[PDB]
Design an enzyme around this catalytic site. Structure first.
Site, mmCIF file in Angstrom:
data_model
loop_
_atom_site.group_PDB
_atom_site.id
_atom_site.type_symbol
_atom_site.label_atom_id
_atom_site.label_comp_id
_atom_site.label_asym_id
_atom_site.label_seq_id
_atom_site.Cartn_x
_atom_site.Cartn_y
_atom_site.Cartn_z
ATOM 1 N N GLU A 125 -9.357 9.965 5.368
ATOM 2 C CA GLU A 125 -9.576 9.028 6.466
ATOM 3 C C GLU A 125 -10.121 9.813 7.654
ATOM 4 O O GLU A 125 -9.431 10.691 8.189
ATOM 5 C CB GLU A 125 -8.274 8.333 6.861
ATOM 6 C CG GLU A 125 -7.743 7.348 5.823
ATOM 7 C CD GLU A 125 -6.636 6.453 6.381
ATOM 8 O OE1 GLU A 125 -5.521 6.952 6.635
ATOM 9 O OE2 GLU A 125 -6.877 5.241 6.559
ATOM 10 N N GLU A 162 0.844 -1.181 0.000
ATOM 11 C CA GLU A 162 0.000 0.000 0.000
ATOM 12 C C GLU A 162 0.882 1.235 0.000
ATOM 13 O O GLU A 162 1.865 1.308 0.739
ATOM 14 C CB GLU A 162 -0.896 0.030 1.229
ATOM 15 C CG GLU A 162 -1.800 1.226 1.257
ATOM 16 C CD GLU A 162 -2.729 1.202 2.429
ATOM 17 O OE1 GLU A 162 -2.511 0.385 3.349
ATOM 18 O OE2 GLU A 162 -3.683 1.994 2.433
#
Ligand SMILES: OC[C@H]1O[C@@H](O[C@H]2[C@H](O)[C@H](O)[C@H](O[C@@H]3[C@H](O)[C@H](O[C@H]4[C@H](O)[C@H](O)[C@H](O)O[C@@H]4CO)O[C@H](CO)[C@H]3O)O[C@@H]2CO)[C@@H](O)[C@@H](O)[C@@H]1O
Length: 223
Positions: free
Chosen positions: A204, A120
């Site tokens: 987020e 990631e």
């Protein structure tokens, strides 16, 4: 708005772009809600916004709602010449615990599910409050004309590299291949064995709100 997405995993797709009201961690909240809204779209990019409030689960991400760039599966990272992207965004208040970040998954299996990968790559354009990336910081690196604090960690069996801007970058024109290049030659990242899985920009959200992140423009060009 043209489209309103309030359900968990509510989804819109058009013009080679998509939006996902990706409330994957909402079970960690004691209360809250979040919707994503499409303001406009064309082949040249999209405009959208999201509004949310979340409480509880202090260090748990509640959601990463995003706009994603679509592309065919099967592109090896070393076969990609350019991954340019442009974004302009702003939060209506910074009194939140949240970030603004690109999220990219890669995997040896070109058909890997879109919810994770072997690796990631996150690029945090802003960090509000005391929220921390996965892992530990390893120092400051110069990538694509800017400096970033690089964090490296594991999320299960997935290795996560997070590049953190030193101050909020509300407008950013980047070449994401430079980040893959940096990792390939400085962090042992096996770019020649990895395929692009997702390419996303979003926020987020941990706690705070009600708050709105507006994306005045998002586009990406992969060739
Ligand atoms: O594509 C349309 C279908 O959506 C499906 O929902 C998927 C959805 O596509 C999301 O992308 C979601 O992925 C989740 C998160 O993006 C998150 O990624 C975390 C990651 O684990 C890192 O550690 C990093 O630090 O943060 C990122 C962003 O917070 O990981 C979670 C947990 O693994 C992923 O779930 O997954 C959704 C649920 O599968 C379907 O709902 C389908 O109906 C749609 O057609």
């Amino acid at each position: 708005q043209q489209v309103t997405l309030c359900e968990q995993y509510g989804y819109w797709s058009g013009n080679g772009y998509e939006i996902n009201n990706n409330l994957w961690g909402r079970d960690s909240a004691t209360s809250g809600w979040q919707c994503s809204y499409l303001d406009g779209s064309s082949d040249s990019g999209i405009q959208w916004h999201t509004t949310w409030e979340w409480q509880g689960g202090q260090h748990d991400v509640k959601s990463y709602v995003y706009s994603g760039k679509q592309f065919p599966r099967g592109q090896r990272i070393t076969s990609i010449n350019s991954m340019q992207t442009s974004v302009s965004w702003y939060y209506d208040t910074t009194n939140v615990r949240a970030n603004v970040a690109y999220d990219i998954f890669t995997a040896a299996d070109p058909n890997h599910v879109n919810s994770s990968g072997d690796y990631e790559l996150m690029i945090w354009l802003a960090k509000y409050g005391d929220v921390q990336p996965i892992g530990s910081p390893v120092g400051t690196v110069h990538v694509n004309g800017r400096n970033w604090e690089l964090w490296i960690g594991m999320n299960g069996n997935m290795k996560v590299f997070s590049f953190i801007a030193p101050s909020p970058l509300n407008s950013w024109s980047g070449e994401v291949k430079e980040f893959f290049n940096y990792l390939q030659y400085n962090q042992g990242y096996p770019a020649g064995d990895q395929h692009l899985i997702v390419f996303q920009m979003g926020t987020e959200a941990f706690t705070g709100g009600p708050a709105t992140m507006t994306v005045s423009h998002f586009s990406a060009n992969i060739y």
